[PDB]
Design an enzyme around this catalytic site. Structure first.
Site, PDB file in Angstrom:
ATOM      1  N   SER D  71       0.845  -1.174   0.000  1.00 61.56           N
ATOM      2  CA  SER D  71       0.000   0.000   0.000  1.00 61.56           C
ATOM      3  C   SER D  71       0.888   1.233   0.000  1.00 61.56           C
ATOM      4  CB  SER D  71      -0.850   0.083   1.275  1.00 61.56           C
ATOM      5  OG  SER D  71      -1.265   1.412   1.477  1.00 61.56           O
ATOM      6  N   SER D  72       0.353   2.309  -0.603  1.00 61.92           N
ATOM      7  CA  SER D  72       1.130   3.552  -0.590  1.00 61.92           C
ATOM      8  C   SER D  72       1.126   4.161   0.804  1.00 61.92           C
ATOM      9  CB  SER D  72       0.552   4.536  -1.599  1.00 61.92           C
ATOM     10  OG  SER D  72      -0.745   4.905  -1.101  1.00 61.92           O
ATOM     11  N   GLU D  73       0.193   3.715   1.670  1.00 60.00           N
ATOM     12  CA  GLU D  73       0.174   4.234   3.032  1.00 60.00           C
ATOM     13  C   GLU D  73       0.856   3.316   4.040  1.00 60.00           C
ATOM     14  OE1 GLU D  73      -3.028   7.132   3.462  1.00 60.00           O
ATOM     15  OE2 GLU D  73      -4.487   5.770   2.735  1.00 60.00           O
ATOM     16  N   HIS D  92      -6.972   0.920   8.245  1.00 64.45           N
ATOM     17  CA  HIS D  92      -6.985   2.320   7.870  1.00 64.45           C
ATOM     18  C   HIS D  92      -8.088   2.572   6.857  1.00 64.45           C
ATOM     19  CE1 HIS D  92      -6.001   6.325   6.790  1.00 64.45           C
ATOM     20  NE2 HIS D  92      -5.768   5.944   5.537  1.00 64.45           N
ATOM     21  N   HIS D  94     -10.909   5.791   4.872  1.00 60.13           N
ATOM     22  CA  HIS D  94     -11.340   7.155   4.672  1.00 60.13           C
ATOM     23  C   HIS D  94     -12.869   7.215   4.849  1.00 60.13           C
ATOM     24  CE1 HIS D  94      -7.632   8.118   1.805  1.00 60.13           C
ATOM     25  NE2 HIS D  94      -7.255   7.657   2.984  1.00 60.13           N
ATOM     26  N   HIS D 155      -8.021  13.720   6.293  1.00 57.45           N
ATOM     27  CA  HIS D 155      -7.599  12.433   5.734  1.00 57.45           C
ATOM     28  C   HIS D 155      -8.491  11.257   6.059  1.00 57.45           C
ATOM     29  CE1 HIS D 155      -3.938   9.710   4.786  1.00 57.45           C
ATOM     30  NE2 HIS D 155      -5.063   8.989   4.736  1.00 57.45           N
TER      31      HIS D 155
HETATM   32 ZN   LIG Z   1      -5.373   7.200   3.809  1.00 54.07          ZN
END
Ligand SMILES: [Zn+2]
Ligand SMILES: [Zn+2]
Ligand SMILES: [Zn+2]
Ligand SMILES: [Zn+2]
EC number: 4.1.2.17
Lengths: 206, 206, 206, 206
Positions: D71-73, D92, D94, D155
């Site tokens: 994941s980019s996060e 995580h 949104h 975020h």
């Molecule tokens: Zn995020």
């Protein structure tokens, strides 16, 4: 009217309640009047793993079957049964709109003719007391004296009726009334209501 | 155009309406023009247990078939049919956004070009009268004179069209318009609307 | 990249869009760049009855296949394709939150870092013009010059991207951003936003 | 406790999270503590195409398996694991209500007794820092010192617990609390809360 038929319906009410969107935060609990006490959902087990044998019996003295943990909110189910002799089933949940009205500590007034389904011209809001205590039980028993459903401040909803079908139906109806009240309250305060005489005609009619 | 094909579609409209989220508090009722009166949903039976043989026929005089109880809201279905000769199907429900606008006792103004689907530049709101009375019927018949859908104060929505498909579609559209109006009304009042000339062009266009 | 594979995906995008809750009032339309024009959904046919052979081809001159009626909103699909050469697919809908922002005639500002998905620090709102006219097409073509998605005042949303997957994804993302903006706008106005420099870093990063 | 059993559960948590309505804008990511680092979802691949072999291992040094993009996060998943030794799983997302509170840059106060599920009398909101940076990681590690869940300004949400089941459950609970806070905040500000002593009793009780 065997034990396992009553256990199956409790479970189906759990599932139906989740499907309707009333059981968010996987917080509800459901019970039925049985013998000298009640059958209720257990604590800890997620609704979807529930089987007939998970359902717990709690007697009139408050003693539960051996090796089974009843819902952590069982005491006010027992309080509803002793306060309203005509109640055979109890639905409890933390449905969002209802809980949101219960955080404002407001009663729901007669903004729709369907308010008469719970017995009068309002849906009361009983005062907060720590979950699971004798004090919470007393406030619920006083609120249910002349109403079939009540909000619990900072907490959620309790609804009682003659069977599981009607109790779920009522619980759902109060969540619609709660959403209608919060939606209009954000626009205008106070919200227009029907008069006590108009509610009296509807009551006779039902 | 047999009786049982019309009974099947009524039922499918009940189901579709529930799936769309318009039948909350299990409150709707649906009818179709038939022979000298109409076929309508019965009272008491939950939508999901409904079978073709549950559907009730009510004649032009208001007499219903023997041993069947028509919806408790049947009179304003009959009022819609006599007020709008072109109507072949009627959808009634207590959809939340629509009912919330009907508690503010407001008409829905031209906030979107799709308002023209019900005939003009607004969605009226007829005045409250006890459910099931002659007086409720008159207000609905006057409101439907130049509109295909109307809100009913403190109550819900009625929509009528040439067939069940279009009537459900209209009912759903009014619920979207109701939600758009309440969402923007909480931000700004009044809400910006399109002009009567702009609505006239859209009407010609449809 | 045969015609029928492109027809199947259009249909799956219709269905997926409905399942996500963006196609309420059964109002969307979807297209793909093809040969010298595009393939688009037809007018009148409900999404669920749609078959591969229902999809209509419209050429660069605006002529459509014989015996098929393209969506009534086809012109601004053609305008998107000529304004943004890199666009291969277009999603149009009347999603509620987006349409509600478009009734306030507001742009969506940088309230979340995901605003950068449509190209800049905002989601514009093009001025109203009657549906289906040359004038609506011009405003959409100017709005899409430096953005991949735009609101249309009193109307809905248009989103364009390199393929159907990304276009639906973008359309959905703008509906989330629209809901976040309306939710916070009801509490505080104006809503706190991220600075242009902060948005510039995010853009480089994507 | 094999690698593929942990990969299957990550995926089921992705699916369950989408079904619950927390993964809108197809933005979440999920991880589990494993060996010297963690297993996490990959970037780019839509949840529904995810297979066991897509799951990526990232070690204690931050090196990931060859030919797989985490994941980019991923960095703040690693920050959660080092800040809270007792955490075995991280969710995580949104989710809309949570993100809306995070745009107001507000903490969620004790408006419901279930706030105690994340450890104290509030749900903090950590300050904004560009996604994927060392600075975002530090703010998350400081916020999670005495709480199991935190909002991230502009975020979304991060929630951590002893296993995937409880972490999803917590994440969902915070989304209910976020929705209750925004619903009441639009009516009255400030919102009534339970006192610190009352929250202390609930904490002992849990
Ligand atoms: Zn995020
Ligand atoms: Zn409770
Ligand atoms: Zn009614
Ligand atoms: Zn349109």
């Amino acid at each position: 009217m065997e034990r396992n038929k009553l256990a199956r319906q409790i479970i189906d009410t759990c599932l139906e309640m989740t499907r309707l969107g009333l059981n968010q935060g996987t917080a509800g609990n459901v019970s039925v009047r049985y013998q000298d006490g009640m059958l209720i959902t257990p604590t800890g087990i997620p609704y979807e793993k529930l089987t007939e044998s998970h359902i717990v019996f709690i007697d009139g003295n408050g003693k539960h079957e051996e090796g089974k943990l009843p819902s952590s909110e069982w005491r006010f189910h027992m309080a509803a049964y002793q306060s309203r002799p005509d109640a055979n089933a109890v639905v409890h949940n933390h449905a969002v709109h209802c809980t949101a009205v219960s955080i404002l500590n407001r009663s729901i007034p007669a903004i729709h003719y369907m308010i008469a389904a719970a017995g009068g011209n309002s849906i009361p809001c009983a005062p907060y007391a720590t979950a699971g205590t004798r004090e919470l039980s007393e406030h619920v028993a006083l609120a249910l004296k002349n109403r079939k459903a009540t909000l619990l401040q900072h907490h959620g909803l309790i609804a009682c009726e003659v069977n599981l079908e009607k109790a779920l139906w009522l619980a759902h109806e109060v969540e619609v009334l709660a959403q209608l009240y919060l939606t209009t309250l954000a626009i205008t305060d106070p919200v227009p209501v029907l008069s006590d005489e108009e509610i009296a005609v509807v009551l006779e009619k039902f």
